[PDB]
Amino acid sequence: NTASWFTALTQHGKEDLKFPRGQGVPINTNSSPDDQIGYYRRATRRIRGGDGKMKDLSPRWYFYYLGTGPEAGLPYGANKDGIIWVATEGALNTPKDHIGTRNPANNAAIVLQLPQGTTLPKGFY
């Protein structure tokens, strides 16, 4: 029933999502500098293509604060396929249960915006 607090980043290439150190956490004026830590989770989508076989669509990457989302129990830095970690300089390695996930019935998604000088990888928008 719950979802990410932000809209997705679309992957148009083969390479997975990877940000430089200290970059990647979306802007959120309601969160504090301590809370600037989390991960992006890939959501693969497939449809009945124009021919007759299942064609894959461009995957989407959704941000979730540390200790929240479908991988709430994973610690920061854990190695898992479809999960890449991000953190701003000075963020605490603690779960963000106080922020939690978004319930779509009461709240719309925040438009994902990255701070000034952020280097998005090739094929990510």
Residue numbers in the entry: 48 to 172
What text appears in the publication on this structure?
One central protein involved in the formation of regulatory ribonucleoprotein complexes (RNP) is the coronaviral structural protein nucleocapsid (N). N plays a major role in RNA genome replication, translation, and packaging and has further been found to interfere with host-integrated stress responses and stress granule formation. The N-NTD possesses a peculiar, hand-like three-dimensional fold, with a β-sheet palm and several flexible loops, arranged as fingers around the central β-sheet. The latter, together with the extraordinarily long basic β-hairpin finger, constitutes the positively charged primary RNA-binding surface.
For more detailed structural insight, we solved the high-resolution structures of all NTD nat_mutants and of the WT using X-ray crystallography. In the heart of this network, a triplet of residues appears crucial for stabilizing the intramolecular connection between fingers and palm: Q58 (N-loop), W108 (palm) and F171 (carboxy finger). The apparent specificity is clearly expressed by a more than 40-fold increased affinity of WT for Ext over SL4, contrasting the merely small changes in binding observed in the two mutants.
